[PDB]
Design a protein around this nucleic acid. Structure first.
Lengths: 374, 182, 166, 461, 535
RNA sequence: UUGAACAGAGAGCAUUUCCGGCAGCAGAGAUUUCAGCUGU
C-alpha cells in the first residue's frame, strides 16, 4: 500500500534519533506505532480532516519532546543532523496532503499558512507564495484570503507593488464586496502615510497624494452601484417605473450609508491632509447620481452631507482657536440652510446646537459659545 | 470458489473443488440418495459384487460360443441373479454385463420392496418403519434396512401382528378384529 | 497536448489541470472509451485547480447567455487570467480545452497566448467531467447543482422567449 | 516472576469505524515468506501465459483503404494522429488516425505516387497557418513533385484552398522524397538525386555520386544535415549538406530498399535490403554493420525506428511485419493477417505505441507495439502490478518452460515452411564450411557483420 | 547499512571455491548495489514491527521457571489470553487429535471413536460437528477453514465447511497421518500401508504414490521451508521425501526402535525426533548433522512439537515439558531436566504441565498466539506458553483477522500461484539455477570449435585414452583398469590402442627397472633397430 | 539574427559570501516565540 511507503519514509530519522542516542529503540517503536495508526487513518478510506489535524498535533508534540530531550540529554540545542528538520518537513507534508485532499476547509488552510509563516527562518517565502497561489486559485470568492495575503506581503515583507497587484486581482474577481474596497483604500492611505512620513524623516535628516484613493473611491462607487442594481430585482428587469425608481433610491441609500462608513473610517489618518481627502469624498457626494441628492430624496442625507461639510473643518479639540476663526463659516452654512429648507433647517440648527453643546475662566468663552449658538 | 474472472478461468481450467475425476460423477452419493442407503460403504460393497459378476461374465464370454461349459455357466449365473431379483429377466446374456448394476442390487433391498409393495409411502418411511420394528419377513422380525429380499421371499413381507400400523389399516376399513390382537 | 480544461457550469467556471494525456490514436478503443465512465481512472487524468462561482442568479443568467453566443465575459476573463500562465503568442502557446468551437476565437481574441482545443479528445474529457461533476470538485461549492440547473434553465427559457408576468 | 504474553488489542488490526480498510501488519522475514524462488517463478510463468492470451495487436484498418495498394506512407512528426498515404494509382490521402477517417483525398498524379513526406514550408513571404493547414508533398513518375495543404481540425482558433499550392517539375522521373526538418529544404531521388527548396521551382543542387539511379532517401533527424541514399547498384551513399556534396558510399551484396536514421543516436541508421535481413549501421565507421536483424524470409521492403530509438519495425515481401529490439538481432514479434499482402511501407507512430502498416491490397492498418498492452490509463495498483510482471518476465526470461511460451507465435504456412527449409540449408552450409575449414589452410573467419559489404569508398585506417 | 539484523535477511549465493567486459561489469555492480540496498531497506523494518514476543523470566534464583502453574499464569495475564486458554472436556469419544488452522482462527478436533468438529475456538462458533461412527484417526484443514480432510477407518474423506462430504478418496487406503502443503496445494498422506501419497487438491489428482518400503509409517512431519516431508519408520529411520523422486531424498538413522514423533522448525533448519527407545534427538537439517542427543528419557516421548520461536515441547504420557533455545548448536543448549547444583550451563525446562489422569494424544502450537494446544483423552486444552508465538505476523501471507472477502480473494490468489509439485527440492534456491552438469564457464563457440577439433583428433593423438605413465605401480595402472572394466569378448579400436599403449607403458617400465637395477647403462637404444627403422 | 532597457517566474545551475555559534539591549507577537546593532 502507501501507508507502508510513508511509514518507511519515516525510519531514517529514527535511525538518526537512535544513533544520536536520545530516544531508545523501545520508544522509537512506540512513536512508530502511533505513526502507523495515523498514517493508515490518513491514507485509507473513511478519512477526515480531524485525522489530519490529530496527526499534526501528535507530530508537533513528539517534535517538542525531541527538542526538550535533546537539550536535556546532550546539553546542545540542535544535533545539526537529520533529526531536527525532518519532523518539521513531515508536518509540512501532512498539511500539504490534507490541503490537497480536503480543499474546502479554510480552517485547515489557515493552520497551514500560520504554521508556514511562523516556521521561522527555516521556511521560504516562495513556499508561502505557492500555497497562497493554490489557495487563491481554489477560493477566488473568499475575500479574507486576499486580505490576509496582501497583509502578509506588506505587514511582514513590505512589497507595495505586489500588494497592489493582489488587491487589483482580487478586485478583478469580486467587485461586489465592500470589504475589499475599504481594505484597498486602507492599504493605500497606509502606503501614502508611510510615504509622507518617510519624506518627513528624510527631510529631518537632510506629486503622489490621495488621488489614487480618490480614483479607487470613484470606481468603487460606480462598480458597487452597478452590481447592486444588477443584483436586486434579480432575474430580470421586468418592472414598471415605480419599481425602477424605488430600487434606484434603494441602491442610493446603500451606497451613501457605505460612503458614510468610508468617511468615519477615513478620518483617522492624521498625518496627511484629512481635510482634502475628505473634501474629495464630499465633492463626489455633492454631485447627483440621477437621484437628486439635494434636489430630492436623500434629503436627510443631504442634511447629513451639509452636517459633515460644516464639521469638516470643525473637527477640532475643545481649544477653539479654529472655531473662533471659522464660526462664521458654519453660521453662513446654517443661514443657507435656513434660507432654503423648512424642516431640515430646523433639524440642522438643532443638530448644530447639540454639536456645540457636545463638542464644546474658559467657561466665559462657553457662555460666549452658547450665546453664539443662541 | 469466487466465480473466477475471465483471465482466471482461462488460466486455471482444471480447478474444481467439489467434483473430481475419481468421484466418478458422485454415483455412490446419487444412487444412495435415490434408494436412501443408510451407511456409506453399502454402495461400494455392492459394487464389488457387480464387479465380480461382470468380470465373470467377461471371462465367460471369452470362451468359444459353442462350448457347453460356457453355455451352462451363463445359464446358471443368469438364473441365479434372476431368482435373486437382481436381474429382471433371463432373456439375453448381455444383461450380465449391461444390466447388472448397484442400483439393481439396491432396488432389491427391503425398504424398496416395501415401497413397491405399497407397504409404505416412500423409501424413507419404509426405512423408518423397519427401524421402528414393524416389518417381519415370514415369522421373524427384520430390523436392518439393508436386507435383500429375493423373489420367493417377497411373498412373506408383512407387518408384525400387534403393530399399530396393522391396527390402523384394519380399522380404516373397519375390519379390525380385536380377538386376534389386531 | 491538452494542458488545461475549461468547464462552465451553473455555479461557476472551473479550470482543471490535465495530469495525463488520454490516448490519441486509440481514442475509439474500448478501454479508452470506458475510462471516462470509470472514476478511479478518470481522476488519474483530470484534476481541479480552480473554481470561481457566480454571484447569483443574475450573473448566472448573463454568463449563460454569453456562453451561449460565445462571448468571453468578465468572470471568465478573470479566471483564465488567474490560472493560465503567460505563454508566447508565436511559439508554443498554452493549451486550453473547451467544448465550443465558436467560443474558441473569442478566447483567443482576449488571450492570444492560448490555443483552444475542441476536437473529440477535449470533447470526451469534457463529457467525463460532466459525467462525474460534484465528485471532481473536491466538495467545494455551495448549492445543489440540480437546483441550480433547474433555476437556470427556466431563467434562460423565459429570457429567450420574453416571458411576461404582467 | 514477570509474565508477558502476546496482546493483540483488537483495535490496531480490525478498525473501529466501518468505512475504512483493515491494517496489514507486516513482517519481511524470509521465514515468514518461504518459497521465494518458486513463487516468483510461477508469477513469471503466469505473466507469460497472460501475455500470450492478451496479445491482440490489430487495432483497425483506417478508412476503406486505397484502390491500388499503399506504396508510400509518411507520418508527420509533430502531430500525433495524422498520417499521409499514397497509393499506386495516384490518389494520396491525409488520415486522422483517431477517428480513422481521411481529412482529404487528392488525385495527385497520373503515374504512381512514388514517395511522399510532410513539411512546415518556410516561405520567406507567407506565414502558413500551421495550426490549421498541414502540408504534404509528393513525388511521382509523371515527373512531378507537388506540394499540398490540408484543412485540419485540431484547434478552434479561427472562425479553404486545399489542393496544390505549387507544382515543382523535373526532367526525369522521381522515386523517393524526404524533407529537411528545418529550412524549407527537401530532396528527391529518381534518375539522380536533387536538392530543392520550397521557394524556387528548380533544384538548388544536384548531389549525385555517379550516373546510377537513386531509389531511396532519408534525412537525418537530429544532426539535421546528413542525407542518406540507396542506389540500385546495391549502394548506400551518405550526403552532407554543410559541404553540399556526397560523402562516402559502400556497396553491398544486394540492394537496400529503405533507410531509417536513429532518432536518439544521430549517426546510426538501419537499412532494409533484399537479402532478407536488416543491418544497423554506424555512420562514422561504415566498414561493418553493428547489428544484423535476421528473421524474414523474403525481401525486406521497409524499416522504421520507434521514436524512443529502442526498437525497429520491419515489413517485408513475405506478407508480415516484424518488430526487432535494437540490442538483440532477431525478432521480437511477427504480425501477419490473411488479408495483408506484401507489406511495403511500415512506420512507427510518434507515440512509439502504434505501428502503421501499408500493404499492397490497398489497406493501411494499425497494430500495437506491445500486443499485450492496452491503452487505458492505469491506476497505481495495476500500474505497479504490470511493471512488476514485466520485470519478473525479464529476470526469468530464459527458463525453458517460459522461454518456450514467450517465443511461440502462429506464423502462416508459407512463412513457416520457408523458415524451416532456410534453417536446414543454413545448417548444411555451416557443416560444409566446417569441413573445408578442417582441411584447408587459409580460411579466415569473416564476421556476420562483415559478410555483406563488398566494398567501401574512402577506406578506413 | 550497519543493521544488527542483516544476517537474518541475507541471501546465500554461488561461490566457485573479475571480468574485463565493461558493460557486464557495470551490470554486475548495479546488481550488487541493488542487492545490498534492498537488504538494508528490508532489514530496516524491525523499527516498524508492531508487537513483541512474550517471556517469563524468573527475577530471582529461588523462582524456577518450570514450577509455574497455569493457575499462576492465568492469574498473571490479561482476560483475553486467559479466555483463549480454553478447556473442552468431551469424555466419551476417544483420544482427541487436535489440529489448528494455519492462522490461529479455527480448530479441528478428531475423536478416536467417531467425533470430528471444526470450530472457531475464540468465537464460540462451531461450524461442523459430525459423528462418523467409525474410528477416525487424524484430520487437517486443507487451505482454509472451508475444507478439511479426515483420515477415517480406512478411506480418507474430504468434507466442506459445514460438514457435508465432498470426496471419498479411493486411494489413500489406510491413512493415519495427514498433512497439507499449502503453497503447493497437496494433501500428503501416510499410514499402515507403507506408501506416501500426494493428492493435488485443486484439480483433484494423485500426484505421486511412493513406496516407503519400510512398513507402516510411524511419524510424519512437513518441513515448512522446502515442503519436503520427513517420515519416521520402525527402523528408527527418518526419511526425507519429495513427490518428484520415487526414492527418499535423504535417509537419516535417528533412533533405535521406532520413531514416535518428528517436528521441524519453521526456518527448516532443525528437527527434533523422539523414538520409542526413550530418546530425543535434535538434528541440523541443512547439513544433516546431529546436534543433540537427549538419551534416557524417563518414558518415551510420544509427541514433539516446535513453535514459531524455536521452543521445543515434548510429551511423555501425561507430562508436557517445554525447553527454550534448545534448537542451538552449543552443547550448553542440550535440553536437560535438572541443573545439578545450579549449573548455569544447563538447559532446564522452560515450563511443564502434568495432565494428571490421562495421556496426551498430540501437541500443536496455536500459530500466532502464545498458546500450546494439546489434545488428550478427554478433550482439548490450551496452555499459555508465553515465549511461543510469532507476534509480528505478515498479513498478506496469512491473517488471523481476515474477512470473508479477503478469504475469497486470497483463496483465488494462492490457487493462481499454486506452485507445481515438481519444484519440491531439498532447497528452494534451486529453481533459478543452471544444471549441476552443463559447465559453469559459458562456451562462446570458439571452445565449441576446439571441442570438435579434439573429438576429430581423438584417434591418432589418444585424447580419450589414459596417458602413458610407467611409474604408477602397474598393478593398478589405469590402462589395465580400462581393459578390465571393458567386457572381455568384444574388440574395438579404442581398446586396441589402449592395449598398445599398455604394452608400451610396460616396456618403458621395463627399461626404467633395468636402468635402476643397473643391468644396462643410459639409453644405448638398440643400434640395429634404429638402423632398420624406415622399414 | 543580435542587442538594449523594462516587466517577471520559482521552474532550473552552482559556491566559500554570511547565517542556522554566545552574552548586553531595545522593538514586535501570544511565561514562551519572533524581529538589529557592540566582541567572540
Amino acid at each position: 500500500s502507501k501507508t507502508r511507503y510513508y511509514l518507511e519514509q519515516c525510519i531514517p530519522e529514527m535511525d538518526d534519533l537512535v544513533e544520536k542516542g536520545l530516544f531508545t529503540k523501545n520508544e522509537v517503536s512506540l512513536i512508530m506505532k502511533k505513526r502507523t495508526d495515523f498514517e493508515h487513518r490518513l491514507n485509507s478510506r473513511g478519512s477526515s480532516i480531524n485525522d489530519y489535524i490529530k496527526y499534526i498535533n501528535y507530530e508537533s508534540n513528539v517534535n517538542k519532546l525531541r527538542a526538550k530531550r535533546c537539550k536535556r540529554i546532550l546539553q546542545v540545542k540542535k544535533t545539526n543532523s537529520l533529526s531536527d528538520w525532518s519532523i518539521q518537513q513531515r508536518i509540512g507534508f501532512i498539511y500539504q496532503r490534507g490541503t490537497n485532499k480536503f480543499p474546502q476547509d479554510l480552517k485547515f488552510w489557515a493552520m497551514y499558512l500560520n504554521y508556514m509563516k511562523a516556521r521561522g527562518n527555516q521556511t521560504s517565502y516562495k513556499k508561502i507564495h505557492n500555497i497562497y497561489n493554490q489557495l487563491l486559485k481554489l477560493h477566488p470568492t473568499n475575500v479574507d484570503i486576499w486580505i490576509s495575503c496582501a497583509k502578509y506581503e506588506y505587514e511582514v515583507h513590505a512589497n507595495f507593488k505586489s500588494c497592489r497587484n493582489i488587491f487589483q486581482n482580487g478586485l478583478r474577481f469580486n467587485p461586489d464586496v465592500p470589504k475589499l474596497w475599504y481594505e484597498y483604500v486602507k492599504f493605500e492611505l497606509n502606503f501614502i502615510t508611510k510615504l509622507i512620513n518617510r519624506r518627513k524623516v528624510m527631510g529631518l535628516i537632510n506629486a503622489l497624494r490621495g488621488d489614487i484613493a480618490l480614483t479607487i473611491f470613484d470606481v468603487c462607487m460606480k462598480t458597487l452601484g452597478k452590481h447592486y442594481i444588477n443584483k436586486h430585482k434579480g432575474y430580470y428587469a421586468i418592472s414598471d417605473s415605480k419599481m425602477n425608481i424605488e430600487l434606484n433610491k434603494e441602491t442610493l441609500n446603500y451606497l451613501f450609508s457605505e460612503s458614510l462608513r468610508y468617511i468615519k473610517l477615513f478620518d483617522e489618518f492624521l498625518d496627511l491632509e484629512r481635510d482634502y481627502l475628505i473634501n474629495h469624498v464630499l465633492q463626489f457626494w455633492k454631485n447627483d447620481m440621477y437621484d437628486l441628492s439635494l434636489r430630492k430624496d436623500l434629503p436627510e442625507l443631504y442634511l447629513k452631507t451639509v452636517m459633515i461639510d460644516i464639521t469638516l473643518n470643525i473637527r477640532y479639540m475643545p481649544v477653539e482657536k479654529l472655531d473662533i476663526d471659522q464660526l462664521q463659516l458654519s453660521v453662513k452654512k446654517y443661514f443657507a440652510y435656513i434660507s432654503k429648507l423648512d424642516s431640515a433647517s430646523v433639524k440642522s440648527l438643532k443638530n448644530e446646537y447639540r454639536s456645540y453643546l457636545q463638542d464644546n475662566a474658559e467657561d466665559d468663552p462657553r457662555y460666549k459659545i452658547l450665546d453664539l449658538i443662541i | 470458489v469466487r466465480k473466477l474472472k475471465h483471465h482466471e478461468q482461462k488460466l486455471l481450467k482444471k480447478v474444481d473443488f467439489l467434483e473430481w475425476k475419481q468421484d466418478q460423477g458422485h454415483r455412490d452419493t446419487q444412487v444412495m440418495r435415490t434408494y436412501h442407503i443408510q451407511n456409506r460403504e453399502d454402495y461400494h460393497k455392492y459394487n464389488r459384487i457387480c464387479g465380480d459378476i461382470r468380470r465373470l461374465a467377461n471371462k465367460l464370454s471369452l470362451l468359444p460360443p459353442t462350448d457347453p461349459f460356457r453355455r451352462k455357466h451363463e445359464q446358471l449365473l443368469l438364473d441365479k441373479l434372476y431368482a435373486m431379483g437382481v436381474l429382471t429377466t433371463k432373456s439375453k446374456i448381455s444383461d450380465l454385463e449391461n444390466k447388472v448394476t448397484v442400483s439393481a442390487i439396491c432396488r432389491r433391498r427391503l425398504p424398496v420392496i416395501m415401497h413397491r409393495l405399497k407397504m409404505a409411502e416412500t423409501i424413507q418411511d419404509a426405512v423408518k418403519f423397519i427401524e421402528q420394528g414393524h416389518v417381519r419377513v415370514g415369522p421373524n422380525l427384520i430390523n436392518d434396512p439393508a436386507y435383500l429380499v429375493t423373489r420367493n421371499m417377497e411373498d412373506y413381507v408383512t407387518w408384525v401382528d400387534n403393530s399399530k400400523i396393522k391396527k390402523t389399516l384394519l380399522r380404516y376399513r373397519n375390519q379390525i378384529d380385536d380377538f386376534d390382537f389386531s | 497536448p491538452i494542458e488545461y480544461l475549461l468547464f462552465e457550469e451553473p455555479t461557476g467556471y472551473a479550470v482543471f489541470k490535465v495530469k495525463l494525456q488520454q490516448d490519441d490514436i486509440g481514442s475509439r478503443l474500448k478501454e479508452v472509451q470506458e475510462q471516462i465512465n470509470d472514476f478511479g481512472a478518470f481522476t488519474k487524468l483530470i484534476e481541479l485547480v480552480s473554481f470561481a462561482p457566480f454571484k447569483g442568479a443574475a450573473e448566472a443568467l448573463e454568463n449563460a447567455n454569453d456562453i451561449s453566443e460565445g462571448l468571453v465575459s468578465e468572470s471568465l476573463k478573470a479566471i483564465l487570467d488567474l490560472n493560465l500562465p503567460k505563454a508566447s503568442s508565436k511559439k508554443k502557446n498554452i493549451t486550453l480545452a473547451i467544448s465550443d468551437k465558436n467560443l474558441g476565437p473569442s478566447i483567443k481574441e482576449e488571450f492570444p497566448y492560448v490555443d483552444c482545443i475542441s476536437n473529440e479528445l477535449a470533447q470526451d474529457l469534457i463529457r467525463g467531467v460532466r459525467l462525474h461533476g460534484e465528485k471532481l470538485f473536491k466538495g467545494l461549492q455551495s448549492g445543489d447543482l440540480e437546483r441550480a440547473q433547474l433555476g437556470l434553465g427556466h431563467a434562460y427559457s423565459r429570457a429567450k422567449v420574453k416571458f411576461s408576468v404582467q | 516472576m514477570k509474565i508477558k504474553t502476546i496482546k493483540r488489542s483488537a483495535d490496531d488490526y480490525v478498525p473501529v469505524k466501518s468505512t475504512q480498510e483493515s491494517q496489514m501488519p507486516r513482517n519481511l522475514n524470509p521465514e515468514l515468506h518461504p518459497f521465494e524462488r518458486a513463487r516468483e517463478y510461477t508469477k513469471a510463468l503466469n505473466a507469460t501465459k497472460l501475455e500470450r492470451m492478451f496479445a491482440k495487436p490489430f487495432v483497425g484498418q483506417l478508412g476503406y483503404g486505397h484502390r491500388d495498394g499503399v506504396y508510400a506512407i509518411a507520418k508527420n512528426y509533430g502531430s500525433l494522429n495524422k498520417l499521409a498515404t499514397g497509393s499506386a494509382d495516384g490518389v494520396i490521402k491525409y488520415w486522422n488516425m483517431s477517428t480513422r477517417e481521411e481529412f482529404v483525398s487528392f488525385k495527385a498524379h497520373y503515374g504512381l505516387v512514388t514517395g511522399l513526406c510532410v513539411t512546415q514550408p518556410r516561405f520567406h513571404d507567407k506565414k502558413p497557418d500551421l495550426k490549421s493547414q498541414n502540408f504534404m508533398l509528393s513525388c511521382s513518375d509523371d515527373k512531378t513533385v507537388k506540394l499540398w495543404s490540408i484543412n485540419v481540425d485540431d484547434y478552434s482558433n479561427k472562425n479553404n484552398e486545399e489542393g496544390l499550392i505549387r507544382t515543382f517539375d523535373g526532367e526525369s522521373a522521381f522515386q523517393g522524397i524526404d524533407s529537411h526538418r528545418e529550412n524549407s529544404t527537401f530532396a528527391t531521388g529518381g534518375a539522380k538525386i536533387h536538392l530543392w527548396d520550397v521557394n524556387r521551382l528548380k533544384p538548388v543542387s544536384d548531389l549525385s555520386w555517379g550516373a546510377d539511379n537513386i531509389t531511396s532517401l532519408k534525412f537525418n533527424q537530429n544532426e539535421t544535415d546528413i542525407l542518406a541514399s540507396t542506389g540500385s547498384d546495391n549502394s548506400i551513399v551518405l550526403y552532407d549538406l554543410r559541404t553540399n556534396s556526397p560523402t562516402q558510399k559502400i556497396v553491398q551484396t544486394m540492394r537496400t530498399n529503405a533507410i531509417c536514421w536513429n532518432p536518439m543516436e544521430a549517426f546510426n541508421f538501419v537499412t532494409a535490403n533484399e537479402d532478407h535481413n536488416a543491418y544497423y549501421y554506424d555512420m562514422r565507421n561504415l566498414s561493418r554493420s553493428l547489428n544484423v536483424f535476421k528473421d524474414h524470409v523474403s525481401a525486406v521492403m521497409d524499416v522504421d525506428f520507434s521514436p524512443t530509438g529502442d526498437e525497429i519495425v520491419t515489413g517485408s515481401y513475405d506478407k508480415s511485419i516484424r518488430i526487432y529490439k535494437t540490442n538483440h538481432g532477431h525478432s521480437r514479434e511477427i504480425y501477419h493477417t490473411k488479408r495483408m499482402q506484401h507489406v511495403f511501407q511500415v512506420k512507427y507512430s510518434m507515440d512509439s505505441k502504434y505501428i502503421i502498416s501499408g500493404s499492397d491490397d490497398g489497406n493501411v492498418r494499425l497494430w500495437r507495439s506491445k500486443a499485450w498492452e492496452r491503452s487505458n490509463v492505469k491506476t497505481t495498483r495495476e500500474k505497479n502490478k504490470l511493471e512488476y510482471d514485466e520485470k519478473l518476465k525479464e529476470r526469468f526470461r530464459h527458463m525453458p518452460e517460459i522461454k518456450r511460451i514467450s517465443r511461440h507465435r502462429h506464423v502462416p504456412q508459407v512463412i513457416k515452411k520457408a523458415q524451416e527449409i532456410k534453417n536446414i540449408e543454413l545448417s548444411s552450409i555451416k557443416r560444409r564450411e566446417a569441413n573445408e575449414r578442417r582441411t584447408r589452410k587459409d580460411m579466415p573467419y569473416i564476421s556476420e557483420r562483415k559478410k555483406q559489404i563488398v566494398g567501401t569508398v574512402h577506406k578506413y585506417e | 547499512k550497519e543493521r544488527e539484523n542483516q544476517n537474518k535477511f541475507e541471501r546465500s549465493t554461488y561461490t566457485n571455491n573479475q571480468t574485463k567486459d565493461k558493460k557486464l561489469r557495470a551490470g554486475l555492480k548495479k546488481i550488487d548495489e541493488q542487492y545490498k540496498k534492498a537488504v538494508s531497506s528490508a532489514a530496516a523494518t524491525d523499527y516498524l514491527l508492531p508487537e513483541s514476543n512474550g517471556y517469563l523470566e524468573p527475577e530471582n534464583e529461588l523462582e524456577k521457571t518450570f514450577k509455574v502453574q497455569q493457575s499462576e499464569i492465568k492469574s498473571s495475564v490479561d482476560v483475553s489470553t486467559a479466555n483463549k486458554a480454553l478447556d473442552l472436556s468431551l469424555k466419551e469419544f476417544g483420544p482427541y487429535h487436535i489440529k489448528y488452522a494455519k492462522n490461529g482462527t479455527h480448530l479441528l478436533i478428531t475423536g478416536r471413536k467417531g467425533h470430528v468438529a471444526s470450530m472457531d475456538w475464540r468465537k464460540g462458533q462451531l461450524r461442523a460437528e459430525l459423528f462418523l461412527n467409525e474410528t477416525c484417526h487424524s484430520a487437517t484443514y486443507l487451505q482454509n477453514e472451508q475444507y478439511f480432510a479426515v483420515a477415517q477407518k480406512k478411506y480418507t474423506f474430504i468434507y466442506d465447511h459445514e460438514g457435508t462430504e465432498l470426496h471419498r478418496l479411493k486411494q489413500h487406503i489406510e491413512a493415519r497421518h495427514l498433512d497439507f502443503l499449502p503453497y503447493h496445494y497437496l494433501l500428503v498422506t501416510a499410514g499402515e500401508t507403507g506408501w506416501l501419497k500426494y493428492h493435488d487438491v485443486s484439480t483433484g489428482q494423485l500426484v505421486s504414490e511412493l513406496r516407503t518400503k519400510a512398513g507402516p509409517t510411524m511419524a510424519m512431519a512437513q518441513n515448512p521451508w522446502n515442503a519436503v516431508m520427513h517420515l519416521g519408520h520402525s527402523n528408527g529411520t527418518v526419511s526425507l521425501w519429495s513427490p518428484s523422486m520415487p526414492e527418499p531424498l535423504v535417509k537419516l538413522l535417528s533412533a533405535r526402535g521406532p520413531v514416535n514423533s518428528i517436528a521441524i522448525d519453521r526456518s527448516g533448519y532443525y528437527m527434533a525426533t523422539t523414538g520409542a527407545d526413550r530418546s530425543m534427538k535434535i538434528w541440523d537439517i541443512r547439513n544433516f548433522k546431529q546436534l543433540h542427543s537427549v538419551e534416557s528419557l524417563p518414558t518415551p516421548g510420544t509427541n514433539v512439537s516446535i513453535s514459531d520461536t524455536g521452543l521445543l515441547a515434548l510429551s511423555r504420557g501425561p507430562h508436557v515439558t517445554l525447553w527454550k533455545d534448545a534448537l542451538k548448536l552449543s552443547g550448553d543448549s542440550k535440553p536437560c531436566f535438572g541443573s545439578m547444583g545450579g549449573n548455569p550451563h544447563r538447559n532446564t525446562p522452560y515450563m511443564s504441565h502434568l495432565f494428571a489422569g490421562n495421556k496426551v494424544e498430540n501437541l500443536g502450537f496455536v500459530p500466532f498466539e502464545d498458546l500450546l494446544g494439546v489434545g488428550h483423552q478427554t478433550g482439548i486444552t490450551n496452555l499459555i506458553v508465553p515465549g511461543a508465538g510469532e507476534a509480528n505476523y505478515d498479513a498478506l501471507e496469512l491473517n488471523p483477522f481476515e474477512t470473508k472477502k479477503q478469504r475469497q480473494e486470497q483463496e483465488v490468489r494462492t490457487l493462481l500461484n499454486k506452485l507445481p509439485a515438481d519444484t519440491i527440492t531439498l532447497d528452494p534456491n534451486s529453481i533459478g539455477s543452471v544444471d549441476k552438469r552443463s559447465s559453469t564457464i559459458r562456451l562462446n563457440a570458439k571452445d565449441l570449435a576446439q571441442t570438435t577439433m579434439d573429438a576429430n583428433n581423438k584417434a591418432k593423438t589418444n585424447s580419450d585414452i589414459p596417458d602413458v605413465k610407467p611409474d604408477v605401480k602397474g598393478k593398478n595402472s589405469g590402462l589395465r583398469s580400462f581393459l578390465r572394466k571393458k567386457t572381455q569378448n568384444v574388440i574395438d579400436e579404442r581398446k586396441l590402442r589402449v592395449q598398445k599403449q599398455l604394452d608400451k607403458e610396460k616396456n618403458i617400465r621395463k627399461r626404467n627397472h633395468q636402468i635402476k637395477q643397473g643391468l644396462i647403462s643410459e639409453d644405448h637404444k638398440d643400434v640395429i633397430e634404429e638402423a632398420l627403422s624406415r622399414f
